[PDB]
């Protein structure tokens, strides 16, 4: 397909265009709404500033296409695959990312307030300045993503696999870390008051580093603690 | 006895004046050091800068004597009463002073270094300034005592009493602390680096104050150590 019928179907009122190839379209700014592009084949597209509000892409593949800025807010991406793409600043509030490929997708500043990421695959993506306020990370990959002034206050990231993340100056404010793997990651600046630490497995330098005002912790933990503080046993 | 006799007794050698009544006497500046005035009656004293060293002292009655700049280097004191006694800016330096009376006593700027003061009671005194470096406490009584800027480095404290104490800025590097109970005492910038706490009651609030590093610390107590910095369990 090309790019002036499917503005122009749309407009007409089509909504289910899934499993189109619309590989590598440039559809800069045009508006999605509601659209059913699941399964499609959406590789290196340029959809950057696109509306996609409330669409349906599960199991499309957006591997390394432009969404920069784009409008994902409660879109359904289960299972897609936008490894390597482009979402710096775009809009995912409310989103469905669940068990989704986003290895080193770009995700700066982008907004996943709320979304659904349980057991996506983040590996080596950049979420610096992100807003995960309150999504859910549950079980997803974390290794080495930058998370650098990202806010996660109150999200889920029970079992989440942190290892060699950047945590650093990010707004963990009562969020879940029960099982999680912190080894490697830096706290540098993290908040972490009022998280629930337990069963994770951290780091002895978190303790130095990120505020803990009200964290919940394990015995076996709180005893490190201290020992990181100087106390000898 | 009186002033003239005892003076002139000493001077001709007598060294021999234990349970001699001496009561108000006036002995300031005077030279009795090695004299034997063990049980003697020395209530109200001005002894005021005597010459005191390795005197045997032991049962005697000094309550609200004046021994303000005595020298009292390894004099015999053990058992003897001390209260309300004015001690300031002595020299107790390796005296034997296990089991005596300094209730109330003031010890300002005192020197009771590498002394023997096991099982006794320093209650209510003023040791604001004083040097007990490497003393034995093992047992005493320093209830409500106020140890400001004091030297207590390498001291044993085990199982001494110091509820209600003032340890703010006092130097407690190596000392011994098992079992002691510091409830209710000041800890505001007071140093226990290297201490063995092991056993100890403390407050949460000793933990948050005095420099912990290196201290040595129950299971129980590093756990009650992260808590006092806000870690919830």
Not at 20 to 46: C, F, K, M, R, V
Not at 180 to 192: E, F, K, Y
């Amino acid at each position: 397909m090309n790019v002036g019928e499917i503005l122009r179907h749309y407009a007409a009122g089509k909504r289910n265009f899934q499993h189109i190839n619309l590989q590598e379209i440039e559809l800069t700014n045009a508006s999605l709404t509601g659209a059913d592009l699941s399964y499609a084949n959406l590789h290196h597209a340029n959809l950057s500033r696109a509306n996609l509000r409330s669409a349906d892409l599960r199991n499309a593949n957006l591997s390394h296409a432009n969404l920069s800025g784009a409008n994902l807010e409660e879109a359904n991406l289960e299972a897609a695959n936008l490894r390597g793409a482009d979402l710096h600043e775009a809009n995912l509030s409310g989103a469905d990312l669940q068990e989704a490929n986003l290895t080193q997708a770009n995700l700066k500043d982008a907004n996943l307030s709320d979304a659904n990421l349980e057991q996506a695959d983040l590996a080596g993506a950049d979420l610096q300045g992100a807003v995960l306020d309150g999504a859910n990370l549950h079980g997803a990959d974390l290794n080495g993503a930058d998370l650098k002034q990202a806010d996660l206050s109150g999200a889920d990231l029970g079992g989440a696999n942190l290892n060699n993340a950047n945590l650093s100056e990010a707004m963990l404010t009562r969020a879940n870390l029960e099982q999680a793997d912190l080894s490697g990651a830096r706290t540098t600046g993290a908040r972490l008051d009022d998280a629930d630490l337990r069963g994770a497995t951290v780091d002895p330098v978190l303790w130095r580093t990120a505020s803990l005002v009200g964290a919940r912790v394990d015995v076996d933990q709180a005893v490190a603690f201290a020992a990181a503080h100087g106390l000898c046993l």
